[PDB]
């Protein structure tokens, strides 16, 4: 009913859907585990996968008018409604569970802050899910309040993220002597010269780092998810998604190098730990920074780039501003996924290729708003939160986004190589073997990311294919 | 030019192509490693895969007239000439390399017999390849002598197998006291009661047993390989292949249970090892059979169901008859594969879907005899013999037959489930989901048998697909 296009929708939705819970919490630990010279490489590899998927989605976008939904209609019209429906359903489930993961990360950070600050609630183990129930109810309420309300919430949350990043960079740029027990020392070149090497940890490897980091990098093409509600389809999507991926990669690289050069892996924060600069053996950069707060090798000391989780916030002044940055990032990501998934399910139900899902069709609202999809995603997310401890199935579903991207790329490759009556791409570049390379990279990542879960993913895709084909749509 | 059908071709070719080098050598060791209660199970599982593949091939056969070749034309006419050519090429390569491995196993057994009997040649390590070259020359000479010549050789070789099995069963049925140091004791119930349990060994497991045994069970549907030279296509193939698989499974089960109940895992063959039957502790079945030739647990003793390799021959009188049995079986299997592969390559080259293979087309001879394919298979086999030590790449090519079977089963499933204009099966049974279940078994076995080699097989199939698609045949 309301046509809004490139700027607001694409920019803020991509910004706050790629910027997940990882950025402020997991990034510091993952860059303290792996040096900058290799964290940059892993971010660049994930960026390569992301940008090839974006180019592939843009290639499908410039073909022609999109009826609606996301990957579903694209895969259907390109390489068969059976694959289209399978990919749409699997990706909708992936997004519906990513909603629960985003909001449970929100729950973890909020309960950690609450417990640290003043008090704690009864049964802190499940207090995360307890607060998650109410915050998911609130998120559903604000999401089902039309599109203008959610757009306003998205833009103000992006503003909050921008102010949080500004506070972070301002705090790091200005050195403070109060953080002598901590790793923050003010961009000392000693910390930089000791961080460009891949200095791993006890049990984490390159592939463990990649599987921890990657779910942050997914959430792209959210504009393509809701292509049926954009003012300028087939034109805004490429120029928006490419710029969003570029800026997100740049900000990840910048924050990674800054936090790597700003902190140290050995910060024994304690009252006794001072900057006396005692004439010790000086094997580590501790004495080069401060004589006290050293000797973390013998026993596991307090924290610092290896154990701390509020390092990204405590590095800069006004810690509540950073914490609100975490809250806004996770809430915005959950909102973006919770809006993207049900309209895709509506696209699935529109063509009636699934006889069983007669319901969950177009309902109330001035536009084609799938409220029933909103309730369905609400219930799925609530059930998965009630399950709790999502890390166990985190790499089970980490390859469902891989499945979606790989089917996108393979569909583009099949439509380009094998001539089709209506392929007719329009975006200017498109060496079509790049889509094949992206598909191969997606499959390689799938096999790396819990190969058993990958095999289960192909089994589920084949089951969906045989189910939809046996139903003989007509 | 000559139409010969069910009896001679189908019967003898299936008998002598499924009956490979394994039966007389590896079977005794594998049944000494895996008990009857589990060896029967593994044989039955391989039989289930084999018979599902046979039923699937029969389903394709009764559709209509076959132009020629094997899985190539079937897969093409069912689900695309691209997959047809990919499957035909990969299966032809698999058969061409299996020829080399069959003949090098023949080389191993013949050089072992020669070294044991009178003398040995220089450089016994490569004496196997030395004799293999000349015996491959003899094989190509007898194979390129028309169809009647190879049929006569095949039938006389199969007769030799019948006499070998008769000698074996006659020797086992009649107990001999001369084999007291050996495990042959005359169907004593003590040996049977102590062998029906899955008594494994140091490092071999169930899946190692499966990967060792399975290449014996492959070689089926050789009549379907040469469907272009059969008197009664689409009618003889099912009733022949099913009966051949049934009888081969029955003879494997019978020989396995007989050799299990006939020998023991502890036969310390030595002059001191007698049948004195001393009153020892008698924890093992040795003293239960004969007091001497016991105590093989402390140190690795001579042989017997765990180390012996000519036990299948020494169990029965007239060992040279058994040795001729091995020779005839391996020569017949190599001949069958060396006849099946090049006509399939001829079918590949006939449709010209591979433009680069302009040569290797129909040549001299009264019938459509692909001599150029004979030389091609000769060169590939000679190269792989010169490579030597084929066991390293045995699990590599073990999944190529799995690939052919899985694609054939998926062909039947896709043609039956997804409606096709000309499916029209005629064989009576066909609960169509059996094709799906067999395809799933084939994929699971592929993953078990060197999952990395399975992944390589999928990569090669995808490469062949994209190569044949990019060439845009018209
Ligand atoms: C299939 C989609 C998965 C989304 N989950 C996710 C997204 C991001 C991100 O970058 O947006 C980062 C991570 S994380 N903490 O680095 O592993 C994620 O895993 C979570 C999130 C919170 C709780 C436990 C696991
Ligand atoms: C892809 C097809 C392979 C066929 N090769 C094969 C067939 C059979 C059989 O049952 O016909 C048994 C075996 S074996 N000795 O059990 O491993 C085989 O592998 C050999 C053979 C001899 C030397 C080393 C490996
Ligand atoms: Cl996605
Ligand atoms: Cl085969």
mmCIF file of N, CA, C and O in Angstrom, chain B residues 282-322:
data_model
loop_
_atom_site.group_PDB
_atom_site.id
_atom_site.type_symbol
_atom_site.label_atom_id
_atom_site.label_comp_id
_atom_site.label_asym_id
_atom_site.label_seq_id
_atom_site.Cartn_x
_atom_site.Cartn_y
_atom_site.Cartn_z
ATOM 1 N N UNK B 282 42.057 -75.925 28.009
ATOM 2 C CA UNK B 282 40.999 -75.951 26.997
ATOM 3 C C UNK B 282 40.027 -74.780 27.175
ATOM 4 O O UNK B 282 38.829 -74.940 27.433
ATOM 5 N N UNK B 283 40.593 -73.580 27.018
ATOM 6 C CA UNK B 283 39.777 -72.383 26.864
ATOM 7 C C UNK B 283 39.451 -72.130 25.396
ATOM 8 O O UNK B 283 38.389 -71.588 25.077
ATOM 9 N N UNK B 284 40.353 -72.513 24.495
ATOM 10 C CA UNK B 284 40.154 -72.343 23.064
ATOM 11 C C UNK B 284 39.717 -73.657 22.427
ATOM 12 O O UNK B 284 39.787 -74.724 23.044
ATOM 13 N N UNK B 285 39.266 -73.568 21.175
ATOM 14 C CA UNK B 285 38.770 -74.736 20.458
ATOM 15 C C UNK B 285 39.878 -75.607 19.879
ATOM 16 O O UNK B 285 39.579 -76.684 19.350
ATOM 17 N N UNK B 286 41.136 -75.175 19.960
ATOM 18 C CA UNK B 286 42.247 -75.951 19.421
ATOM 19 C C UNK B 286 42.303 -77.335 20.057
ATOM 20 O O UNK B 286 42.136 -78.345 19.367
ATOM 21 N N UNK B 287 42.515 -77.386 21.377
ATOM 22 C CA UNK B 287 42.549 -78.667 22.078
ATOM 23 C C UNK B 287 41.216 -79.395 21.974
ATOM 24 O O UNK B 287 41.171 -80.629 22.040
ATOM 25 N N UNK B 288 40.118 -78.648 21.832
ATOM 26 C CA UNK B 288 38.834 -79.282 21.558
ATOM 27 C C UNK B 288 38.877 -80.062 20.252
ATOM 28 O O UNK B 288 38.192 -81.081 20.111
ATOM 29 N N UNK B 289 39.674 -79.599 19.289
ATOM 30 C CA UNK B 289 39.915 -80.346 18.058
ATOM 31 C C UNK B 289 41.170 -81.210 18.170
ATOM 32 O O UNK B 289 41.111 -82.429 17.980
ATOM 33 N N UNK B 290 42.310 -80.591 18.474
ATOM 34 C CA UNK B 290 43.572 -81.306 18.600
ATOM 35 C C UNK B 290 44.455 -80.578 19.602
ATOM 36 O O UNK B 290 44.602 -79.354 19.533
ATOM 37 N N UNK B 291 45.057 -81.342 20.518
ATOM 38 C CA UNK B 291 45.844 -80.738 21.590
ATOM 39 C C UNK B 291 47.018 -79.936 21.040
ATOM 40 O O UNK B 291 47.305 -78.834 21.521
ATOM 41 N N UNK B 292 47.706 -80.470 20.036
ATOM 42 C CA UNK B 292 48.824 -79.758 19.438
ATOM 43 C C UNK B 292 48.319 -78.609 18.566
ATOM 44 O O UNK B 292 47.114 -78.411 18.380
ATOM 45 N N UNK B 293 49.272 -77.844 18.027
ATOM 46 C CA UNK B 293 48.982 -76.706 17.152
ATOM 47 C C UNK B 293 48.071 -75.688 17.837
ATOM 48 O O UNK B 293 47.129 -75.165 17.237
ATOM 49 N N UNK B 294 48.352 -75.407 19.105
ATOM 50 C CA UNK B 294 47.573 -74.468 19.898
ATOM 51 C C UNK B 294 48.442 -73.298 20.344
ATOM 52 O O UNK B 294 49.607 -73.169 19.955
ATOM 53 N N UNK B 295 47.844 -72.438 21.170
ATOM 54 C CA UNK B 295 48.519 -71.285 21.770
ATOM 55 C C UNK B 295 49.035 -70.320 20.699
ATOM 56 O O UNK B 295 50.230 -70.038 20.596
ATOM 57 N N UNK B 296 48.101 -69.813 19.895
ATOM 58 C CA UNK B 296 48.405 -68.769 18.926
ATOM 59 C C UNK B 296 48.155 -67.366 19.461
ATOM 60 O O UNK B 296 48.412 -66.392 18.744
ATOM 61 N N UNK B 297 47.653 -67.235 20.691
ATOM 62 C CA UNK B 297 47.355 -65.912 21.232
ATOM 63 C C UNK B 297 48.619 -65.193 21.687
ATOM 64 O O UNK B 297 48.738 -63.974 21.521
ATOM 65 N N UNK B 298 49.568 -65.926 22.275
ATOM 66 C CA UNK B 298 50.769 -65.299 22.820
ATOM 67 C C UNK B 298 51.608 -64.658 21.719
ATOM 68 O O UNK B 298 51.953 -63.473 21.790
ATOM 69 N N UNK B 299 51.936 -65.428 20.686
ATOM 70 C CA UNK B 299 52.712 -64.933 19.564
ATOM 71 C C UNK B 299 51.973 -65.204 18.258
ATOM 72 O O UNK B 299 51.137 -66.112 18.190
ATOM 73 N N UNK B 300 52.254 -64.442 17.201
ATOM 74 C CA UNK B 300 51.568 -64.687 15.927
ATOM 75 C C UNK B 300 52.046 -65.975 15.278
ATOM 76 O O UNK B 300 53.171 -66.047 14.771
ATOM 77 N N UNK B 301 51.198 -66.998 15.293
ATOM 78 C CA UNK B 301 51.572 -68.311 14.786
ATOM 79 C C UNK B 301 51.456 -68.328 13.261
ATOM 80 O O UNK B 301 51.295 -67.290 12.612
ATOM 81 N N UNK B 302 51.546 -69.523 12.673
ATOM 82 C CA UNK B 302 51.761 -69.643 11.234
ATOM 83 C C UNK B 302 50.607 -69.051 10.432
ATOM 84 O O UNK B 302 50.771 -68.043 9.736
ATOM 85 N N UNK B 303 49.429 -69.659 10.522
ATOM 86 C CA UNK B 303 48.320 -69.303 9.640
ATOM 87 C C UNK B 303 47.038 -69.925 10.181
ATOM 88 O O UNK B 303 46.994 -70.436 11.304
ATOM 89 N N UNK B 304 45.989 -69.863 9.364
ATOM 90 C CA UNK B 304 44.709 -70.474 9.668
ATOM 91 C C UNK B 304 43.593 -69.473 9.879
ATOM 92 O O UNK B 304 43.441 -68.914 10.971
ATOM 93 N N UNK B 305 42.813 -69.235 8.821
ATOM 94 C CA UNK B 305 41.614 -68.401 8.850
ATOM 95 C C UNK B 305 41.901 -66.955 9.244
ATOM 96 O O UNK B 305 40.976 -66.141 9.336
ATOM 97 N N UNK B 306 43.169 -66.618 9.478
ATOM 98 C CA UNK B 306 43.531 -65.254 9.842
ATOM 99 C C UNK B 306 44.724 -64.770 9.029
ATOM 100 O O UNK B 306 44.881 -63.566 8.800
ATOM 101 N N UNK B 307 45.567 -65.699 8.588
ATOM 102 C CA UNK B 307 46.764 -65.373 7.827
ATOM 103 C C UNK B 307 46.921 -66.182 6.550
ATOM 104 O O UNK B 307 47.545 -65.695 5.605
ATOM 105 N N UNK B 308 46.383 -67.397 6.497
ATOM 106 C CA UNK B 308 46.524 -68.231 5.315
ATOM 107 C C UNK B 308 45.767 -67.631 4.135
ATOM 108 O O UNK B 308 44.694 -67.037 4.281
ATOM 109 N N UNK B 309 46.345 -67.797 2.948
ATOM 110 C CA UNK B 309 45.725 -67.332 1.715
ATOM 111 C C UNK B 309 45.409 -68.443 0.727
ATOM 112 O O UNK B 309 44.580 -68.225 -0.166
ATOM 113 N N UNK B 310 46.030 -69.616 0.848
ATOM 114 C CA UNK B 310 45.708 -70.775 0.026
ATOM 115 C C UNK B 310 44.898 -71.805 0.805
ATOM 116 O O UNK B 310 44.842 -72.978 0.427
ATOM 117 N N UNK B 311 44.274 -71.376 1.905
ATOM 118 C CA UNK B 311 43.460 -72.284 2.710
ATOM 119 C C UNK B 311 42.264 -72.775 1.905
ATOM 120 O O UNK B 311 41.858 -73.938 2.008
ATOM 121 N N UNK B 312 41.679 -71.889 1.095
ATOM 122 C CA UNK B 312 40.556 -72.274 0.249
ATOM 123 C C UNK B 312 40.939 -73.355 -0.752
ATOM 124 O O UNK B 312 40.060 -74.077 -1.236
ATOM 125 N N UNK B 313 42.224 -73.474 -1.080
ATOM 126 C CA UNK B 313 42.704 -74.524 -1.968
ATOM 127 C C UNK B 313 43.196 -75.745 -1.200
ATOM 128 O O UNK B 313 42.899 -76.881 -1.586
ATOM 129 N N UNK B 314 43.947 -75.530 -0.117
ATOM 130 C CA UNK B 314 44.478 -76.628 0.681
ATOM 131 C C UNK B 314 43.402 -77.365 1.466
ATOM 132 O O UNK B 314 43.661 -78.474 1.944
ATOM 133 N N UNK B 315 42.212 -76.779 1.614
ATOM 134 C CA UNK B 315 41.141 -77.452 2.340
ATOM 135 C C UNK B 315 40.694 -78.705 1.594
ATOM 136 O O UNK B 315 40.327 -79.713 2.209
ATOM 137 N N UNK B 316 40.728 -78.668 0.265
ATOM 138 C CA UNK B 316 40.286 -79.772 -0.569
ATOM 139 C C UNK B 316 41.466 -80.353 -1.336
ATOM 140 O O UNK B 316 42.470 -79.672 -1.570
ATOM 141 N N UNK B 317 41.339 -81.617 -1.718
ATOM 142 C CA UNK B 317 42.360 -82.260 -2.521
ATOM 143 C C UNK B 317 42.448 -81.655 -3.909
ATOM 144 O O UNK B 317 41.571 -80.926 -4.372
ATOM 145 N N UNK B 318 43.554 -81.967 -4.583
ATOM 146 C CA UNK B 318 43.842 -81.457 -5.923
ATOM 147 C C UNK B 318 43.862 -79.928 -5.929
ATOM 148 O O UNK B 318 43.040 -79.263 -6.563
ATOM 149 N N UNK B 319 44.824 -79.381 -5.189
ATOM 150 C CA UNK B 319 45.007 -77.932 -5.128
ATOM 151 C C UNK B 319 45.202 -77.266 -6.489
ATOM 152 O O UNK B 319 44.676 -76.155 -6.674
ATOM 153 N N UNK B 320 45.944 -77.835 -7.450
ATOM 154 C CA UNK B 320 46.043 -77.181 -8.766
ATOM 155 C C UNK B 320 44.704 -76.957 -9.444
ATOM 156 O O UNK B 320 44.569 -75.984 -10.195
ATOM 157 N N UNK B 321 43.710 -77.815 -9.207
ATOM 158 C CA UNK B 321 42.372 -77.550 -9.727
ATOM 159 C C UNK B 321 41.818 -76.254 -9.147
ATOM 160 O O UNK B 321 41.248 -75.426 -9.868
ATOM 161 N N UNK B 322 41.999 -76.049 -7.842
ATOM 162 C CA UNK B 322 41.563 -74.802 -7.222
ATOM 163 C C UNK B 322 42.321 -73.619 -7.811
ATOM 164 O O UNK B 322 41.728 -72.576 -8.113
#
